[PDB]
Design a protein around this ligand. Structure first.
Ligand SMILES: COc1cc(O)c2c(O)c(C(C)=O)c(CC(C)=O)cc2c1
Ligand SMILES: COc1cc(O)c2c(O)c(C(C)=O)c(CC(C)=O)cc2c1
Lengths: 317, 317
């Protein structure tokens, strides 16, 4: 039976059939243990749930599904369509629906599940979707072979900063730079330092989970995983040629997300990304290291350029 | 008779006397050539006239007063008491009142005049005051002897940045850093780069007056002089330990201000300040160089720590 957590509160429905299964879980984002955490970012005084919030729940229903059938869960094909504003005024029910389909009777052969995230009063808004994948360790093995190359990019960023070539932002100064666009729940302000090579939207950052409070139970703490994606959002938005009064880069989702080691709330990690240039979309990979160890990887993290002013409008609509 | 300019529109009253004289001038800050200029900073969508606007008028009425009795005018003892919001909705008449006092027949020996700045509809608000002084060149001579020393502080700041010790902000990134506190009329965005030693609130900045448009006639262009004081305000507000969502440093005035060379709108200048350490107030000197030449100097520029939120309240009321 699925363990309830800070971010997954009850099972609404759990049905097996011959050609598939449906699992519906529910999270009251107004519940007092989670409401604070659900309010990750703040834009024009409007609180916003981060994609990492869905990713946590996805990892949970995926891990459960994968164990129930028989291993790494990949939160893949994440698409964030509509803002979720945790109002904190009476129940606000986020329903996460996981569906699986199969041949008879190869249920145990199943390597993916479709996941949808929608708030209910019933239906309020459909927010996001992803596909969880029960994946191989092939990527992990490949990442392990590239560790030394990632470490080299990181070292070269620090060397450049030490020569006056690249900007290095202390934690509070980085958040100040972003503050006309978004403010952050303090528990999400986990970027300790960030070195940015603006020419390639390329960043090396120390993320220190000890800098926030992360009480509760999770598969992947939404603050910890949002801090990882913040590094790529900062690389884009902190470029001297991006005028954040007019245009801002927002997280649209990603192609793949795997976690290989605990995201420990007493530890700091190294995060490296080269986003680059590219319609209204940029994409790139984000790796998380713990010294020599591969901790996590976003493949094809996607940020969308949106008008600052029209963002304001839609969020107030 | 006093030359009218972009920032001084008409003489309201001009009386000489046995024991002194009164000169009252008027500037309609809604007039189309000046209204843009008058709106130098923007806080919470509220436009604000900068202290440099009063300093320009002070130099003009001071130079005139000095010339008509019988070379440097010092805009000294500047105190900025109340915000001036150029609404641009019908006339908004800034009245600058200069008063002088003297012995019988000794008018020619007069070395200072009291200046007050108040808007009228009639009395609206009293904004600021200063004392213009007809001063010696002793300070100028002293500054010329320190040139090499100022240049050394500047070179040391650049050296430190080249070793990764001090922050260097490109123009647009500096203004992005300040943007949750204030936005700036583009004609005021003249800070080309700034290197900051946060430990001592110590900055060297290139200010490039060619970066804005400054059409009109002035004694000292309000954008150009404000850009000089921005270097000190930035030094304080860009400190990692100053949370601009809570407290901001605002210009309160200064003890002395002298200009020794034209502030040429095609030229860039070097500005150096060491504000140092946080009562309500910080103070320090700001020097302006053009290579080897002394161009201008604020002695005892004063910034006041004000609550960001309570700043908002007052301005909105
Ligand atoms: C206008 O469309 C959207 C939709 C979203 O889901 C959005 C969203 O989730 C966010 C979030 C979570 O931050 C933002 C603002 C940022 C990047 O800080 C803006 C959004 C804007
Ligand atoms: C609350 O009291 C004041 C009085 C002023 O005259 C103020 C003032 O002139 C200003 C400005 C800009 O001129 C400001 C805001 C800043 C530093 O950008 C804030 C002010 C705040």
């Amino acid at each position: 039976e699925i363990k309830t957590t800070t971010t997954l509160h009850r099972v609404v429905e759990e049905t097996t059939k011959p050609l598939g299964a449906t699992l519906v879980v529910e999270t009251d984002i107004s519940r007092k243990d989670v409401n604070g955490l659900a309010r990750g970012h703040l834009v024009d005084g409007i609180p916003l749930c981060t994609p990492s919030f869905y990713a946590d729940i996805a990892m949970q229903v995926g891990q459960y599904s994968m164990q129930r059938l028989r291993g790494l869960v990949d939160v893949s094909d994440m698409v964030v369509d509509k803002a979720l504003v945790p109002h904190g005024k009476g129940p606000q029910l986020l329903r996460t629906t996981l569906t699986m389909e199969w041949p008879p009777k190869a249920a145990a052969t199943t390597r993916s599940a479709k996941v949808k995230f929608a708030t209910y009063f019933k239906l309020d808004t459909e927010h996001a979707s992803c596909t969880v994948r029960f994946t191989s360790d092939a990527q992990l093995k490949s990442l392990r072979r590239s560790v030394s190359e990632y470490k080299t990019h990181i070292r070269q960023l620090h060397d450049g900063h030490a020569k006056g070539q690249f900007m290095r932002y202390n934690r509070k100064t980085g958040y100040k730079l972003m503050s006309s666009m978004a403010r952050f729940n303090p528990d999400y302000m986990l970027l300790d330092y960030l070195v940015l090579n603006e020419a390639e939207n390329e960043a090396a950052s120390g993320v220190d989970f000890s800098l926030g409070s992360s009480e509760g139970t999770f598969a992947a703490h939404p603050a910890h995983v949002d801090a990882i994606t913040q590094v790529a959002g900062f690389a884009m938005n902190a470029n001297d040629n991006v005028d954040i009064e007019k245009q801002v880069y927002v997280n649209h989702g990603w192609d793949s997300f795997q976690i290989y080691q605990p995201l420990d709330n007493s530890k700091s990690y190294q995060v490296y990304t080269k986003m680059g240039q590219a319609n209204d979309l940029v994409h790139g990979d984000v790796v998380v290291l713990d010294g020599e160890q591969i901790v996590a990887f976003f493949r094809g993290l996607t940020l969308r350029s949106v008008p600052r002013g029209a963002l304001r409008v839609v969020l107030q609509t």
